């Protein structure tokens, strides 16, 4: 699930409601403390709509417990974040299928046409001669995440 521990308190009265837009500043860290995301580093607060499920479940449930002005530490298990890894999402492709500029590189994102018609991203993990290993698992799958979240305000 998601554990919520206060860093500094909010107003204790104004709590997010379904359909409102939350405006937050956050730092994202792996379980060992290594930073992987930050809205402060972008000089730009991050917005999402409560109940829209456009952020991970741990954020929906965790931020719903915060009052405006509050800063809290959200510890989120993988099943409440970006899932667990699946070997079905590690596939092998010929260099023939790489058609972007240059040669394929480790860590490059390749866009493939999904069954729904959208383009889904895969990350090159290995190159073995003509065979490219592409991982379609979310890069953070199976990892517990720790977020320092500040609820700056609520919008309509």
From Swiss-Prot:
Residues 19-155 form the PPIase FKBP-type domain. InterPro entries: FKBP-type_PPIase, PPIase_dom_sf, PPIase_FKBP_dom. Interacts with TGFBR1; prevents TGFBR1 phosphorylation by TGFBR2 and stabilizes it in the inactive conformation. Interacts with ACVR1B and SMAD7. Identified in a complex composed of RYR1, PDE4D, PKA, FKBP1A and protein phosphatase 1 (PP1). Interacts directly with RYR2 and RYR3. Interacts with GLMN; rapamycin and FK506 abolish the interaction with GLMN in a dose dependent manner. Interacts directly with RYR1. It comes from Homo sapiens (Human). It is an enzyme of class 5 (isomerase). It is found in: Cytoplasm, Cytosol; Sarcoplasmic reticulum membrane. GO terms for molecular function: activin receptor binding; calcium channel regulator activity; FK506 binding; I-SMAD binding; macrolide binding; peptidyl-prolyl cis-trans isomerase activity; signaling receptor inhibitor activity; transforming growth factor beta receptor binding. It holds the Pfam family FKBP_C. It is a peripheral membrane protein. Keeps in an inactive conformation TGFBR1, the TGF-beta type I serine/threonine kinase receptor, preventing TGF-beta receptor activation in absence of ligand. Recruits SMAD7 to ACVR1B which prevents the association of SMAD2 and SMAD3 with the activin receptor complex, thereby blocking the activin signal. May modulate the RYR1 calcium channel activity. PPIases accelerate the folding of proteins. It catalyzes the cis-trans isomerization of proline imidic peptide bonds in oligopeptides. Gene3D superfamilies: 3.10.50.40. This is Peptidyl-prolyl cis-trans isomerase FKBP1A. Its EC number is 5.2.1.8. The modification N6-acetyllysine is found at residue 52. The lineage of its organism: Eukaryota, Metazoa, Chordata, Craniata, Vertebrata. GO terms for biological process: 'de novo' protein folding; amyloid fibril formation; heart morphogenesis; heart trabecula formation; negative regulation of activin receptor signaling pathway; negative regulation of transforming growth factor beta receptor signaling pathway; positive regulation of canonical NF-kappaB signal transduction; protein folding. Belongs to the FKBP-type PPIase family. FKBP1 subfamily. Inhibited by both FK506 and rapamycin. Keywords: Acetylation, Cytoplasm, Isomerase, Membrane, Rotamase, Sarcoplasmic reticulum. The gene is FKBP1A. Disulfide bonds: none annotated.
């Amino acid at each position: 699930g998601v554990q919520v521990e206060t860093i500094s308190p909010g107003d204790g009265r104004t709590f997010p409601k379904r359909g409102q837009t939350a405006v937050v500043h956050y730092t994202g860290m792996l379980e060992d403390g290594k930073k992987f995301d930050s809205s402060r580093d972008r000089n730009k607060p991050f917005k999402f709509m409560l109940g829209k499920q456009e952020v991970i479940r741990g954020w929906e449930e965790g931020v719903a417990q915060m009052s405006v002005g509050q800063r809290a530490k959200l510890t989120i298990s993988p099943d409440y974040a970006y899932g667990v890894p699946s070997p079905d999402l590690i596939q092998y492709f010929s260099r023939r299928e790489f058609m972007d500029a240059g040669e394929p590189e480790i860590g490059a994102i390749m866009l493939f046409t999904a069954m729904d018609g959208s383009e889904m991203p895969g990350v090159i993990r290995e190159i073995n001669g003509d065979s490219i290993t592409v991982d379609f698992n979310h890069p953070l799958a199976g990892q517990t995440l720790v977020f320092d979240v500040e609820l700056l305000k609520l919008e309509a």
